[PDB]
């Protein structure tokens, strides 16, 4: 050093870092990218719990994003920004345990509340380096210290032979946990406040956040949580020990492989071979189901999330949860016959019934009948536009809306301060067709403030709307309350309660308070369907 920028030199537990001064529309921000927090989980370390990164010598260059965790890459619509925006934007490697810090420039002199982002992607994909997760805007406009980590996905992160020493399960969640510990120890060096840490995440990221709430060793590592369109409870976010074991051994067979021997053989397989067979282990033809996800191990998760949220005391927990208007639409083009992004996807009654079997793969013929009958419009039972929309609702309700409603209800009944929202604005920049509405994932670019980038062609009102959302999120992180104190003009966001069930609509219009989060329909999914399946 000596001729470098003295404002970008920082020491952490493992050694010295040099970050980079980024340009944001409002001014500069500090970025420290590709900071290693674990020893590379490769070779004999594949499927193993991560170990803390061993100290390095000299100045680690922290000016670029590091490798993305080895993962399936989406092929359905090549070159289409709608899918490609979620695809890896750095080299795929098993050496991928790195994290990223964004702060104001110069760095804050007083301890600043920290936001930690956990990406989604069904636990089979994702990366902290995607453009939609750019932390520079929150850092610049709101003064946030923002952290995001890579964690192992797919087999690498979640293949488990429960009870074994060599593949104990949930190691991708342990990657996340190790990053949270890194923040506690080191974030003060960047001006961050380890006594004020808020997790947020979307989809599998949301489910991860929920699991950290439900896992005791994680509870000492953060203070507040935001769950966007995902939950630990529900049909996709976990598997039993038996089911993880069965999937792990099937995959082993499919790539040509006593747990020790089975795992030793798997560890000799090229990463890509595992990826190429990952989807073949699902027990049924299905959408919104992922082969390798957290396992109920009786360790990280001491019981099912269902049982844990039913018996947990969440007195000192503040939580923000919500959904987008059309959670299920995105998933339909990946498996339900009759659906495509390139046409209006009007479907027949027969295609609806078939689509229900795929969207609710665990349903008996009778439960499937219950779903079809509940979602049918009996005034227009053959109308193809309603059927298409009902198929979307089936998938979004089963997988996201009702699990969320269930989570908010249990958390609120048991001490938590809960705030709930529905996100209803469709980006003017959206490349998916109109019938898909506001699809899964499409609130993220607003929370992170992408509309502030002039090159992205968002409207003026969308720019203002993004600033509103950044305020809610950052005020929640700061105070546990999305409302602003210096502002009694704007309508207030009341907490979700069991008695009144209030949530707010997020759109271009000022906040509107609504009541009941699909109450009738979620009673069907959350109270009735389980009884029917268990008989």
Ligand X SMILES: *[C@@H]1O[C@H](CO)[C@@H](O)[C@H](O)[C@H]1NC(C)=O
For binding to a second copy (CB under 8 A), which residues are involved?
366, 369-370, 373, 376-379, 501, 515-516, 519-520, 522-524, 527-528, 531-532, 535
Residue with token string 């990946």: 334
| Among ligand X, a second copy, ligand Q4Q, none, partner that 242 touches (CB below 5 to 8 angstroms by kind) | none
Q: Is 36 in the site for ligand Q4Q (CB under 6 A)?
A: no
Q: Is 142 in the site for ligand Q4Q (CB under 6 A)?
A: no
Cβ–Cβ contacts within 10 Å for residue 143, how many? 15
Q: What share of the chain is helix, strand, coil (3-state, %, to 5)?
A: 40, 20, 45
Q: Kindly state the smallest distance separating residue 345's Cβ from ligand X, in Å.
A: 6
* Cα-based distances in Å from 156 to 97, 173, 293: 12, 12, 11
Q: Is 104 in the site for ligand Q4Q (CB under 6 A)?
A: no
| Among ligand Q4Q, a second copy, ligand X, none, partner that 330 touches (CB below 5 to 8 angstroms by kind) | ligand Q4Q
Per annotation, catalytic residue among 148, 203, 329, 392: 203
Q: Kindly state the smallest distance separating residue 81's Cβ from ligand X, in Å.
A: 8
Q: Is 234 in the site for ligand Q4Q (CB under 6 A)?
A: no
Q: Is 424 in the site for ligand Q4Q (CB under 6 A)?
A: no
Q: Kindly state the smallest distance separating residue 155's Cβ from ligand Q4Q, in Å.
A: 15
Q: What is the distance between the alpha carbons of residues 351 and 357, in angstroms, rounded to a whole number?
A: 10
Which residue, 189 or 346, is less far from ligand X as judged by CB? 346
Question: 419 - beta bridge partners?
Answer: 320
Query: Residue with the closest Cβ to ligand Q4Q?
Result: 441
Q: Which of 300, 331, 496, 525 binds ligand Q4Q (CB under 6 A)?
A: 331
Output the CA angle 101-105-111, nearest 5 degrees.
Answer: 70
Q: Kindly state the smallest distance separating residue 371's Cβ from a second copy, in Å.
A: 11
Q: What is the distance between the alpha carbons of residues 208 and 453, in angstroms, rounded to a whole number?
A: 29
Q: Kindly state the smallest distance separating residue 330's Cβ from ligand Q4Q, in Å.
A: 5
Per annotation, catalytic residue among 440, 443, 445, 462: 440
Instruction: Return the exposure string of 317-353: e unless at least 16 CB atoms fall within 10 Å of the residue's CB, then b.
Output: bbbbbbbbbbbbbbbbbeebebbebeeebebeeebbe
Specify burial of residue 305 (Cβ count, 10 A radius: 0-12, 13-18, 19+).
buried
Q: Kindly state the smallest distance separating residue 405's Cβ from a second copy, in Å.
A: 10
Q: What is the distance between the alpha carbons of residues 531 and 500, in angstroms, rounded to a whole number?
A: 26
Please, are residues 336 and 287 in contact by the beta-carbon 8 Å criterion? yes
Q: Is residue 440 among the annotated active site residues? A: yes
Q: Is 330 in the site for ligand Q4Q (CB under 6 A)?
A: yes
Q: Kindly state the smallest distance separating residue 227's Cβ from ligand Q4Q, in Å.
A: 13
Q: Kindly state the smallest distance separating residue 455's Cβ from ligand X, in Å.
A: 6
Alpha carbon dihedral 43, 49, 54, 59, in 10-degree steps, equals 80
Question: 202 - beta bridge partners?
Answer: 228
Q: Residues near 497 by Cβ (< 8 Å), separated by ≥ 6?
A: 412, 418
Per annotation, catalytic residue among 142, 202, 278, 327: 327
Question: 22 - beta bridge partners?
Answer: 29
Q: What is the distance between the alpha carbons of residues 107 and 419, in angstroms, rounded to a whole number?
A: 31
Q: Is 432 in the site for ligand Q4Q (CB under 6 A)?
A: no
Q: What is the distance between the alpha carbons of residues 128 and 26, in angstroms, rounded to a whole number?
A: 23
Specify burial of residue 440 (Cβ count, 10 A radius: 0-12, 13-18, 19+).
buried
Which residue, 274 or 391, is less far from ligand X as judged by CB? 391
Q: Kindly state the smallest distance separating residue 65's Cβ from ligand X, in Å.
A: 20
Whether the CA torsion 46, 52, 54, 56 is positive or negative: it is: positive
| Among a second copy, ligand Q4Q, ligand X, none, partner that 203 touches (CB below 5 to 8 angstroms by kind) | ligand Q4Q
Site string for ligand Q4Q, 440-469 (x = CB under 6 A): xx----------------------------
Number of residues that make up the chain: 535
For binding to ligand X (CB under 6 A), which residues are involved?
338, 340, 342-343, 345-346, 456-457
Q: Kindly state the smallest distance separating residue 374's Cβ from a second copy, in Å.
A: 8
| Total residues binding ligand Q4Q (CB under 6 A) | 12
Residue with token string 């990826």: 275
Q: Is 496 in the site for ligand Q4Q (CB under 6 A)?
A: no
Q: Is 297 in the site for ligand Q4Q (CB under 6 A)?
A: no
Q: Is 334 in the site for ligand Q4Q (CB under 6 A)?
A: yes
Q: Which of 459, 207, 414, 438 is nearest to 312 (CA)?
A: 414
Q: What token pair was written down for 297?
A: 């191990």
Q: Which helix (H) or strand (E) holds 272?
A: helix 271-277
Q: Which helix (H) or strand (E) holds 417?
A: strand 417-423
Q: Is residue 277 among the annotated active site residues? A: no
How far is residue 327 CA from its own chain's centroid? 13
| Among ligand X, a second copy, ligand Q4Q, none, partner that 340 touches (CB below 5 to 8 angstroms by kind) | ligand X
Q: Which of 120, 135, 201, 305 binds ligand Q4Q (CB under 6 A)?
A: 120
Q: Which of 134, 142, 175, 202 binds ligand Q4Q (CB under 6 A)?
A: 202
Q: Is residue 306 among the annotated active site residues? A: no
Q: Is 86 in the site for ligand Q4Q (CB under 6 A)?
A: yes
Q: Is 134 in the site for ligand Q4Q (CB under 6 A)?
A: no
Output the CA angle 231-326-290, nearest 5 degrees.
Answer: 45
| Among ligand X, a second copy, ligand Q4Q, none, partner that 441 touches (CB below 5 to 8 angstroms by kind) | ligand Q4Q
Which residue, 248 or 522, is less far from a second copy as judged by CB? 522
Q: What is the distance between the alpha carbons of residues 315 and 329, in angstroms, rounded to a whole number?
A: 36
| Among ligand X, a second copy, ligand Q4Q, none, partner that 489 touches (CB below 5 to 8 angstroms by kind) | none
Query: Residue with the closest Cβ to ligand X?
Result: 340
Q: What is the distance between the alpha carbons of residues 10 and 19, in angstroms, rounded to a whole number?
A: 8
Q: Please give the residue ranges that form the binding site for ligand Q4Q (CB under 6 A).
A: 74, 86, 120-122, 202-203, 330-331, 334, 440-441
Active site residues: 203, 327, 440
């Amino acid at each position: 050093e000596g001729r470098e920028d003295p404002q970008l030199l920082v020491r952490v537990r493992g050694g010295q870092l040099r970050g980079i001064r980024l340009k944001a529309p409002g001014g500069p921000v500090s970025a420290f990218l590709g900071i290693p927090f674990a020893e590379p989980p490769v070779g004999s370390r594949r499927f193993m719990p991560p170990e803390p990164k061993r100290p390095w010598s000299g100045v680690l260059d922290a000016t670029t994003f590091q490798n993305v965790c080895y993962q399936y890459v989406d092929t359905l619509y090549p070159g289409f920004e709608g899918t490609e925006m979620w695809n890896p934007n750095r080299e795929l490697s098993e050496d991928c345990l790195y994290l990223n810090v964004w702060t104001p420039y110069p760095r804050p002199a007083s301890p600043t509340p920290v936001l930690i982002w956990i990406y989604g992607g069904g636990f089979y994909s994702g990366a902290a380096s995607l453009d939609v997760y750019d932390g520079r805007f929150l850092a610049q406009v709101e003064g946030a210290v923002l952290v995001s980590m890579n964690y192992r996905v797919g087999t690498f992160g979640f293949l488990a032979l429960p009870g074994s020493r060599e593949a104990p399960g949930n190691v991708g969640l342990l990657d996340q946990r190790l990053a949270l510990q890194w923040v506690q120890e080191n974030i003060a060096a960047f001006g961050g406040d380890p006594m004020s840490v808020t997790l947020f995440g979307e989809s599998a990221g949301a489910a991860s956040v929920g699991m950290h709430i439900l896992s005791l060793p994680s509870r000492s590592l953060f203070h507040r949580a935001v769950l966007q369109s995902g939950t630990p409870n529900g049909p996709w976010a976990t598997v039993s020990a038996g089911e993880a074991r069965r999937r792990a051994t099937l995959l082993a067979r499919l790539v040509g492989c006593n747990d020790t021997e089975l795992i030793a053989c798997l560890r000799t397989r090229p990463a890509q071979d595992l990826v190429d067979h990952e989807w073949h282990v699902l027990p049924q033809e299905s959408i919104f189901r992922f082969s390798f996800v957290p396992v109920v191990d009786g360790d990280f998760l001491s019981d099912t999330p269902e049982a844990l949220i039913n018996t947990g005391d969440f007195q000192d927990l503040q939580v923000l949860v919500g959904v987008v208007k059309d959670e299920g639409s995105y998933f339909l083009v990946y498996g339900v016959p009759g659906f495509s992004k390139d046409n209006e996807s009007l479907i027949s009654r027969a295609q609806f019934l078939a689509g229900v079997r795929i969207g609710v793969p665990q349903a008996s013929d009778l439960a499937a009948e219950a779903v079809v009958l509940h979602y049918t419009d009996w005034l227009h039972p053959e109308d193809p536009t309603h059927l298409r929309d009902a198929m979307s609702a089936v998938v979004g309700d089963h997988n996201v809306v009702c699990p969320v409603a269930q989570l908010a209800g249990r958390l609120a009944a048991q001490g938590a301060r809960v705030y709930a929202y529905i996100f209803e604005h469709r980006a003017s920049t959206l490349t998916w067709p109109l019938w898909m509405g506001v699809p899964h994932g499409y609130e993220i670019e607003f929370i992170f403030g992408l509309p502030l980038d002039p090159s992205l062609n968002y409207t003026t009102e969308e720019r203002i709307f993004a600033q509103r959302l950044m305020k809610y999120w950052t005020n929640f992180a700061r105070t546990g309350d999305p409302n602003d104190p210096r502002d009694s003009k704007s309508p207030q966001w009341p907490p979700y309660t069991t008695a009144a069930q209030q949530y707010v609509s997020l759109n271009l219009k000022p906040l509107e308070v609504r009541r009941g989060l699909r109450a009738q329909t979620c009673a069907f999914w959350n109270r009735f369907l389980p009884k029917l399946l268990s008989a």
